[PDB]
Amino acid sequence: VLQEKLRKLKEAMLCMVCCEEEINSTFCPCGHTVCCESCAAQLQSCPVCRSRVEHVQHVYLPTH
Amino acid sequence: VLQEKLRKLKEAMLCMVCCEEEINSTFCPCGHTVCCESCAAQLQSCPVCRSRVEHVQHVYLPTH
Ligand SMILES: [Zn+2]
Ligand SMILES: [Zn+2]
Ligand SMILES: [Zn+2]
Ligand SMILES: [Zn+2]
Secondary structure, three states, X not given: OOHHHHHHHHHHOEOOOOOOOEOOEEEXXXXXXXXXXXXXXXXXXXXXXXXXXXXXXXXXXXXX | OOHHHHHHHHHOOEXXXXXXXXXXXXXXXXXXXXXXXXXXXXXXXXXXXXXXXOEEEEOXXXXX
């Protein structure tokens, strides 16, 4: 079955902190798209690379 | 069937212009993430919404 395939991909599309909303925000300049809009707001650094978040950019991946 | 799914999804991960390379960069402040590095460097305005690209941010997606 591929039901687990989509399950693995969709699970990759979820916020890496609150783990509830989908990824839709980028941390500039490091460019790590790993949070949702409301978790990106609180964080002052990248939870992945630890680089100072200068600005946040709301992305629009058409993976929906 | 689940072929259409994967297909559609993986197709949503392809550059919108060259259609060859994968989507890996976004437009600013635009937001639309629909091109690959090589196509983003060539464009002066967003293909989707038609707004002058002020800056291109490299994306780093948890799927690529
Ligand atoms: Zn979140
Ligand atoms: Zn980062
Ligand atoms: Zn391209
Ligand atoms: Zn646009």
